[PDB]
Amino acid sequence: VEMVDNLRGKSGQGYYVEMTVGSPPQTLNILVDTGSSNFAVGAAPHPFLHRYYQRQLSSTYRDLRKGVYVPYTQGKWEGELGTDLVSIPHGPNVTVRANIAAITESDKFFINGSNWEGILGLAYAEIARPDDSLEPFFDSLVKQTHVPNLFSLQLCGAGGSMIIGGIDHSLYTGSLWYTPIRREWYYEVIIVRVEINGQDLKMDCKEYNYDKSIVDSGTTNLRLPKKVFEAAVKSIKAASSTEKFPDGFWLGEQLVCWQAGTTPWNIFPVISLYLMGEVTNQSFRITILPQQYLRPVEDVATSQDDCYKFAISQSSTGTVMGAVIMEGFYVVFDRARKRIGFAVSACHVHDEFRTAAVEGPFVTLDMEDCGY
Numbered sequence: 001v002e003m004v005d006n007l008r009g010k011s012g013q014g015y016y017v018e019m020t021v022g023s024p025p026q027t028l029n030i031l032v033d034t035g036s037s038n039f040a041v042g043a044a045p046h047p048f049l050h051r052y053y054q055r056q057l058s059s060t061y062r063d064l065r066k067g068v069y070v071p072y073t074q075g076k077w078e079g080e081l082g083t084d085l086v087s088i089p090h091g092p093n094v095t096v097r098a099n100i101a102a103i104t105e106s107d108k109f110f111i112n113g114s115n116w117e118g119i120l121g122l123a124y125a126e127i128a129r130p131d132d133s134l135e136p137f138f139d140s141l142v143k144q145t146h147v148p149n150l151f152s153l154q155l156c157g158a159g160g161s162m163i164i165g166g167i168d169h170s171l172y173t174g175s176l177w178y179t180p181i182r183r184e185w186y187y188e189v190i191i192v193r194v195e196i197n198g199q200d201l202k203m204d205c206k207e208y209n210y211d212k213s214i215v216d217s218g219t220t221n222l223r224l225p226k227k228v229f230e231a232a233v234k235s236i237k238a239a240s241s242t243e244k245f246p247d248g249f250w251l252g253e254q255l256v257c258w259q260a261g262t263t264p265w266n267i268f269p270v271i272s273l274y275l276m277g278e279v280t281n282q283s284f285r286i287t288i289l290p291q292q293y294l295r296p297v298e299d300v301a302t303s304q305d306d307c308y309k310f311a312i313s314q315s316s317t318g319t320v321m322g323a324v325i326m327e328g329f330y331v332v333f334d335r336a337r338k339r340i341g342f343a344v345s346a347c348h349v350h351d352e353f354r355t356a357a358v359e360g361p362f363v364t365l366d367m368e369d370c371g372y
Ligand SMILES: C[C@]1(c2cccc(-c3cccc(Cl)c3)c2)N=C(N)CCO1
Pocket: 011, 012, 013, 014, 015, 031, 033, 034, 035, 036, 072, 109, 119, 216, 217, 218, 219, 220, 323
């Protein structure tokens, strides 16, 4: 219960947890990222940082005498590797020694008003920078304490919770459905079917996972491979035909606004993502409402209206089930059993007619392997 409501933020700028680094403890807000594997923190002033890790003030810091360079698609950072004592004040009652990439230079990485100063990469060593030998935070936490090798995330639209070492039953209703982790690098999973308002996309299921499908709390949108994205936009446009939006909206570049409280939710269809089950050719579905894929953009200047960004976008690196997808579900990262669990959360998306759901089982006797 002491870990409930330990997250802040929103899908657009990320969800963050309070952590402490060094001795005496230096408090920092850290992005919870299941899509990366480095524990990296601002370690020098920047126009967008409220505070930063001051290594000279930590008597427990150890320099590893090794640099790290991390380029992304839209931004990059450089830093120095070292180790220090780390704790999560509203997490497990433990202090561990962990690798820390002290960010000393960055370009288009830190975000103004995000309220976070670093990233907690929760994925596996395989995708760690500079390489797989840099132990990730969670692996250290498990090795040094008696914490079970599992964490869960309950992301909530409008904070949320990160529960480490167990499953909190008060954070979900109904059944918990498991999908296998296909490979331990990202949290890679397999999507076996996609429907938009009950209509199957009918593609070869390998297309849904071209070149991988991941569960990523560090990506805002639902990101889809080109072929799947184009089919999804066609289907959503067809259901929403009573209203015509610019291509800029569908490209995720421009806002669609309606007078406060009048958003026509009913014109937008539900999206069903069928995930591979734990038994051959059995699956379960997670249903995504427009309250998830239409991301609200808060702005006092536009506040006579409710404005949204289309939170589905094209990817050339496979499917990404981002924060907009995770919101309203209780997501169990069961590393011990190499599986990811989904259940409807206490903060699930619903209106008078429709509700986000986790349903199963579904059977498909006529099925190939959906992995690439
Ligand atoms: C490391 C990062 C990353 C880096 C910097 C910022 C974010 C970020 C920014 C806004 C919202 C969110 Cl959820 C994450 C993510 N994490 C990912 N999972 C994909 C992109 O690369």
